[PDB]
Each structure stands twice: as C-alpha cells, then as structure tokens.
Amino acid sequence: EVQLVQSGAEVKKPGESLRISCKGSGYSFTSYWITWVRQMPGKGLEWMGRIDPSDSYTNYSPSFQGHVTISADKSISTAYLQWSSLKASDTAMYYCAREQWLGIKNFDYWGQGTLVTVSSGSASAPTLFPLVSCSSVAVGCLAQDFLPDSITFSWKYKNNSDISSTRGFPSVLRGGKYAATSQVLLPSKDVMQGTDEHVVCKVQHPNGNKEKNVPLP
Amino acid sequence: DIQMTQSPSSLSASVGDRVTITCRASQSISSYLNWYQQKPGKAPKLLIYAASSLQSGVPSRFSGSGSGTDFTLTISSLQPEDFATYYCQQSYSTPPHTFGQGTKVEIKRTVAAPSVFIFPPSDEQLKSGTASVVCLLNNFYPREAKVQWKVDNALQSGNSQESVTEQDSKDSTYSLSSTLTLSKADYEKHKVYACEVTHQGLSSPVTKSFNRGE
Ligand SMILES: *[C@@H]1O[C@H](CO[C@@H]2O[C@@H](C)[C@@H](O)[C@@H](O)[C@@H]2O)[C@@H](O[C@@H]2O[C@H](CO)[C@@H](O)[C@H](O)[C@H]2NC(C)=O)[C@H](O)[C@H]1NC(C)=O
C-alpha cells in the first residue's frame, strides 16, 4: 500500500524560514527517488528538484536552484523541502511524488500537498455560526475568520451517526481572512416524526477544530 | 529547454463521447512521455507512462499513442467522473523535466434549473455586531448563473461574495453559495431581504426573500 503523506498547511511572514516534510510508507524508501513539484495558485505544474535518498544526490531545476534546498532522512523515511528567506512569490501548493529511475522515468505516486501561504497576516482558527431556514429541508453552517485556507467540514446526527448529504463550497477572501459555508438536506418526514431538535456541524483546521449545534425548524 | 505544447486548451463533451488531446514536443523525445490527471483540489494521478502503457488501476478507456514529437491521449467513452485537467510530461531532456500547460475537460449535460434557499443571520452572530445573509443554488447546469441581492428593493453592490462548486461526479451539475455582509446597524434599518437568480433553465427570474421580523 504505497503512500506519501506531507506536512500540514503553513502561514509564514516574508523573510522567515520554513521546512516542509513528505514521509513515505508501504515501500522501501531508498529504492525510489523523491521529486518536488510546485503549483502556483490557479496555474500549472512546475518541476523543482530530486533527491536520491540512498546517497542523497540532488538535482535542482535551473529556475529554483539557490533559493530552495532538498534533503532526506532515510532512517525515518522522510524527505524535506526548505526555504531560508521566504518571499511572497513562494505562496503556492507543493507536491512530493515518488519517481522511478529504471528506464523511462515517471511520477507514479503523489502526496496530498502542502499549502504554503506567505503574507503579513497571522494564523487564526475559524468561528462557526448556524444557518436555519427562516419535501426536504436544508440546513447549513458558516465558518469565518480563519487562516490559512485549509478547512474541512463534517456533520453528525444527535445519535453521533454520520450525515452523508453534505455539500462543499470553496472559500472566499475578505480582509486577510477566509469564510466558507456548508449545507445538508434532510427528509421532511424524518424530522417531523422525530425527537431530535438539532444536528452538529464540525470543522477541522490546523489552528483549531470546532463544533457548533444547528437547530432544526 | 524542451517545450511541451497541448491542444485543445479547454473542451466540453457529452457522456459516451470520444475525447482527444494532443501533446507536441519541440524535439524528438522517443517514448519518454507520461500523462497525468488532476481533478480540482487534489493531487495529480498517473494515467499513461512510456507513451502508451496504462498504469494499473486506471480505467481501460484511457489510452495513449505517439512517438518522437506527436502524442495523443484518448478517452474512448467519456464518463461523468472524468472531468479534470490533463497534463503531459517529458522525461528525456533531464534536467529539467517539463510539463504541458494542461487541457481542461468538462462534461456536457442537459439544462437544469436551480433550487434556491435563503438564510438570515443567526441571533448569535448579531450580538457580535455583524450580519451575514446567505443564498444557495443547488444542482443547476450550465455553470453560468447570476445572483442579485436587494434590500428594500434597492440593489446591492460591492458588498457580497460568492463561490461555485465543481461538477458533481454522477449528475454533472453545479451549486453556488453567495453571502451578503452588512453591519448590524444597517441590517436593522431595512426590513425585506432577497436574492434574485437568473439562469437558462428559468424562463423568469426566481426570487427568494424573508422579512426581518419573522
Ligand atoms: C440516528 O438518527 C438518524 C437520523 O434520524 C434523525 O433524528 C430523527 C429523530 C429526526 O430528527 C430525523 O429527521 C433525523 O434524520 C437515523 O437515520 C434515519 O432513521 C430513521 C428512523 O425512523 C429512518 O426512517 C431513516 O431512513 C434513517 N435515515 C438515514 C439516512 O439513515 C439513524 O437510524 C439513527 N441511528 C441510530 C444508531 O439509531
């Protein structure tokens, strides 16, 4: 079960240093290279560099050479991407990927990605508010005032079972902070014939997870 | 130093149709070409390697051909879950390995009108001093929709934001969320709030509204 797992989202200020991680599992970490790829917000993929964890021989792209450094620690089967003085241009998504070197090379397994946000802002966890309508009823949840933009939603009934009618909307930027919404649809019948008067909205975020009850009209 | 070029830039095709994407190299690269898929908000995924070899676990409707300077990805029968951005990549001129610019593929379906809901600000949010009104559109096609806020029949502007979802992976529709933000002061100055929606599948603009009391 090949698997590459990367560190979480980061918020850093111009001039700071940062080190991202990418840990492999389900294969001999030392028989495959590790490549780093960058995707600027809304743009395509850019190859950054390579490292052979067996001997740590690195190969950088002419574009990125100098401004970035690649390392690895085979004892803990992990590779890293490092900056010494971060710039505004470095705000993007960073992917690690396993690379094959036997014959024609290809990137056969990818990590989930690390969002690097470089700004003068300061990190903050979200604040939750419910959304209630004044043959299926709609109910929602509103998250506000969080940074970075790395948030996840989930819903639960009063009996801690899972609600699978979830709906996911992208975030929007406003005064250095992000906000997002989520909604669920419930059968009109089930609610009337029922003793539950609420449901639970949950958000996950690097700087803090939070819950909020949502009334059912 | 090797430039990879993709065509077409974007395209829209129906379920069951054939989709054809071309990748051109600035100089012979033998069979050192790979194809990737990137559905929005997720990491890429290897589809074809060595120009024409199907990575295990990839649907058999994907296939590749070509050698030298001309290559071609083909989805024999487009499926609703294939909406994504497709890239080619070269592994001959090392360094640097170079990608194509990408080709966006959308699924075409039949017109579908949106379901509309409106939500007032929560009393909890109001004691803190800001009021946010929300308006939701569910399962519509095509993507082009226009939401429109009115407070006491006076049109709003520059005080709202919105966002749109990806295409659903079974029914190929979109959804949209829009938020009107006002100060607690201004919110209790006016009474009737409404969002008006415009869309192909609606022969007449749809309006949803509530009054500040009830
Ligand atoms: C946990 O509860 C869910 C949902 O029921 C909710 O609570 C009711 C009192 C009312 O508020 C409903 O509107 C809510 O949906 C149960 O799921 C449903 O259970 C009913 C039982 O009558 C059944 O008819 C529905 O088909 C179920 N729907 C789904 C999507 O499962 C669930 O069974 C409960 N879990 C446990 C462990 O008891």
Give the residue extent of every domain in chain A: 3-118, 127-215
CB contact under 8 A, B124 and A130: yes
Altogether, the residues listed in chain A come to a count of 217
DSSP A68: B
Q: In units of Å, what resolution does this entry have? A: 2.7
Q: Which CATH class is domain A127-215?
A: mainly beta
Method: X-ray
CATH number for the domain formed by residue range(s) A3-118: 2.60.40.10
The pair of three-digit structure tokens given for residue B1, joined into one six-digit string: 């130093």
Range list for CATH 2.60.40.10 in chain B: 4-108, 115-211
Contacts 24+ apart (CB under 8 A), A163-172: A163/A199, A167/B138, A167/B165, A167/B175, A168/B165, A169/B163, A169/B164, A169/B165, A169/B175, A169/B176, A169/B177, A170/B163, A170/B164, A170/B165, A171/B163, A172/B161, A172/B162, A172/B163, A172/B179
CB contact under 8 A, B138 and A167: yes
> Quick check: A114 and A9 in contact, CB under 8 A?
yes
β pairing state of A177-187 and A136-146: antiparallel
Provide the residue count of chain B. Answer: 214
Phi and psi at A65, nearest 5°, equal: -50, 135
Gap between the terminal Cα atoms of chain B: 66
What is the chain A residue with the closest CA to B212?
A134
Contacts 24+ apart (CB under 8 A), A159-166: A159/A196, A163/A199
In degrees and rounded to multiples of 5, residue B59 shows phi and psi of: -50, 145
Distance from CA of A14 to the nearest CA of B (A): 26
Is A125 in contact with A208 (CB distance < 8 Å)? yes
Q: Is A151 exposed, middle or buried (0-12, 13-18, 19+ CB in 10 A)?
A: buried
**Cα A180 to averaged position of ligand 1 atoms, centre (Å):** 27
Count Cβ neighbours within 10 Å for each residue of B75-112 and write b for 16 or more, e otherwise: beebeeebbbbbbbbbbbeeebbbbbbbbebbbebeeb
Interface A–B counts its CB contacts (< 8 A) at 119
Q: Is A140 in contact with B134 (CB distance < 8 Å)?
A: yes
Q: In the structure encoding, which two tokens stand for residue B35, read together?
A: 């194809």
Closest C-alpha among B102, B72, B30, B67 to residue A104: B30
* CB distance B136 to B177 below 8 Å: yes
**DSSP label at residue B81:** G
Q: Residue B133, class by beta-carbon neighbours within 10 Å (0-12 exposed, 13-18 middle, 19+ buried)?
A: buried
Residues preceding chain discontinuities in chain A with C to N over 2.5 Å: 134
Question: What number does CATH give the domain B115-211?
Answer: 2.60.40.10
- The CATH fold assigned to B4-108 is Immunoglobulin-like (2.60.40)
Q: Are B36 and B44 in contact (CB under 8 A)?
A: yes
CB A156 near ligand 1, within 6 Å: no
- Please name the helix (run of DSSP H) or strand (run of DSSP E) that holds residue A172, with its range, or none: strand A172-174
Contact at CB, A132 and B119, closer than 8 angstroms:
yes
Segment holding A191, helix H or strand E: helix A188-192
Chain A partners of B177 at a C-beta cutoff of 8 Å?
Answer: 169, 181, 183
Residue nearest to atom 29 of ligand 1 (CA): A163
Beta carbon of A186 within 6 Å of any ligand 1 atom: yes
Burial class (CB in 10 A: 0-12, 13-18, 19+), B134: buried
CB atoms within 10 A of CB A30: 13
Which of B32, B85, B117, B174 should be substituted to probe chain A, the one whose Cβ sees the most A Cβ atoms within 10 Å? B117
